[PDB]
Design brief:
Layout (H helix, E strand, L loop, with lengths): L37
The structure holds cadmium ion (4 copies).
The site of one cadmium ion has 8 residues, from loops.
C-alpha cells in the first residue's frame, strides 16, 4: 500500500518497512518526504 502521504505504494524505500514509519518530525501529511527521494 502507499503506506504514506509522502510516498506512493511503489516507494522501494518503504518496500522494506516504511523508512519513514517514524511519525515524529517526518510527518507524512507533508505529501512528500526527504528520505526516500
Ligand atoms: Cd513516506
Ligand atoms: Cd518512502
Ligand atoms: Cd512509507
Ligand atoms: Cd520517506
Amino acid at each position: 500500500k502507499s503506506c504514506c502521504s509522502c510516498c506512493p505504494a511503489g516507494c522501494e524505500k518503504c518496500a522494506k518497512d516504511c523508512v519513514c514509519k517514524g511519525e515524529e518530525g517526518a510527518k507524512a501529511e507533508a505529501e512528500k518526504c526527504s528520505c526516500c527521494q
